[PDB]
Amino acid sequence: SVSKANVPKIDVSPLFGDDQAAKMRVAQQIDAASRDTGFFYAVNHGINVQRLSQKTKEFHMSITPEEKWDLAIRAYNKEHQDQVRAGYYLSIPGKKAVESFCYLNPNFTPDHPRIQAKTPTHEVNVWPDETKHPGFQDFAEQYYWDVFGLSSALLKGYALALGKEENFFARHFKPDDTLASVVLIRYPYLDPYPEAAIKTAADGTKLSFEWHEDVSLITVLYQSNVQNLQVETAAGYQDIEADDTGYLINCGSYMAHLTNNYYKAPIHRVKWVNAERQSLPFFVNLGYDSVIDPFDPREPNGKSDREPLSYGDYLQNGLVSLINK
Numbered sequence: 001s002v003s004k005a006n007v008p009k010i011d012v013s014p015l016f017g018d019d020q021a022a023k024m025r026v027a028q029q030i031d032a033a034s035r036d037t038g039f040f041y042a043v044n045h046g047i048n049v050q051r052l053s054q055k056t057k058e059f060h061m062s063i064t065p066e067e068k069w070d071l072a073i074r075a076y077n078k079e080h081q082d083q084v085r086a087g088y089y090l091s092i093p094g095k096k097a098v099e100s101f102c103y104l105n106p107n108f109t110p111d112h113p114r115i116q117a118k119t120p121t122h123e124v125n126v127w128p129d130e131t132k133h134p135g136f137q138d139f140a141e142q143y144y145w146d147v148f149g150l151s152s153a154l155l156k157g158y159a160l161a162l163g164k165e166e167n168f169f170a171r172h173f174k175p176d177d178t179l180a181s182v183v184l185i186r187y188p189y190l191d192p193y194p195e196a197a198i199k200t201a202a203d204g205t206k207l208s209f210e211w212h213e214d215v216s217l218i219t220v221l222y223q224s225n226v227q228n229l230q231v232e233t234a235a236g237y238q239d240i241e242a243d244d245t246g247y248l249i250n251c252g253s254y255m256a257h258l259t260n261n262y263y264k265a266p267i268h269r270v271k272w273v274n275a276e277r278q279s280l281p282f283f284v285n286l287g288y289d290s291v292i293d294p295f296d297p298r299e300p301n302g303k304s305d306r307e308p309l310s311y312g313d314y315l316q317n318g319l320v321s322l323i324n325k
């Protein structure tokens with residue numbers, strides 16, 4: 001059977017402060033994890049994840065079929081042609097077990113210049129009725145900002161890890177324009193669990209989601225304490241232990257591009273588990289026009305033979321391709 005992946009726990013609390021040497025020692029740990037399996041748990045992160053999980057559970061267990069149609073993305077509801085990313089992603093009982101709710105930057109309001117321009121990947125969030133879900137929109141928008149703050153701190157650590165000044169990524173990660181998304185994913189318990197909703201890997205492993213690299217700079221994930229993720233390493237697929245106190249962090253393919261695969265986007269997949277659980281990723285995206293020149297921390301002159309790629313181009317192309325795969 002399957003070995004346990006090396007997923008260290010890194011105390012990231014110095015990244016919120018002003019002790020520079022202590023931040024360097026965190027950066028080394030991020031470097032090491034990023035060069036090894038590509039995953040680590042951020043601990044001492046400051047976020048109230050238990051309240052996050054409670055508020056999200058109160059949403060998932062009270063939303064009704066009627067509300068799901070009314071919030072649905074265009075893949076499920078042809079009336080909602082402006083909803084490509086943000087909204088409800090329905091289950092299909094008997095066929096597709098997972099369901100989810102995605103929201104974007106709360107600053108993408110009707111008056112935002114990118115919303116006025118109808119720029120791809122920018123949308124105005126949709127929310128359920130306040131009287132049916134009291135406090136949920138306020139909680140969810142505040143969560144966005146709480147995990148944005150953690151993510152900014154982690155990006156300082158990645159920058160220092162790569163030999164850069166600490167604002168190297170974070171200067172492109174701004175409240176007014178970030179393309180970052182939160183997804184509130186419900187994986188259900190079902191008896192019987194329909195086989196059509198279970199995928200099978202080439203090695204026989206039963207899956208809910210097939211192998212992929214993330215479409216992100218980094219991914220900052222809170223999950224229930226139910227083991228399910230696997231990472232491909234040179235030793236094969238290895239189990240990522242659960243830890244519902246920490247945030248599980250990994251690089252996405254934009255980081256791999258920027259660093260010339262020095263920090264790889266690890267390939268991972270989601271095992272099928274018949275359990276009622278949550279998976280709450282924050283996909284750390286930059287702004288639409290953000291471009292960082294690619295570099296290589298293994299080469300003496302730092303030069304890379306990769307071409308600069310705007311984050312908007314990356315993200316549009318990536319979200320489609322992941323849907324296709």
Ligand SMILES: CC(C)[C@@H](NC(=O)[C@H](CCS)NC(=O)CCC[C@H](N)C(=O)O)C(=O)O
Pocket residue numbers: 085102180181183209210212214215269270281283319322323
């Ligand atoms: C680990 C993976 C299997 C898990 N989260 C992801 O990495 C996957 C990748 C393809 S679904 N999720 C997604 O990328 C979908 C949400 C993106 C969101 N709609 C956005 O546009 O910002 C998932 O969707 O199950």
Ligand SMILES: [Fe+3]
Pocket residue numbers: 212213214268
């Ligand atoms: Fe993923």
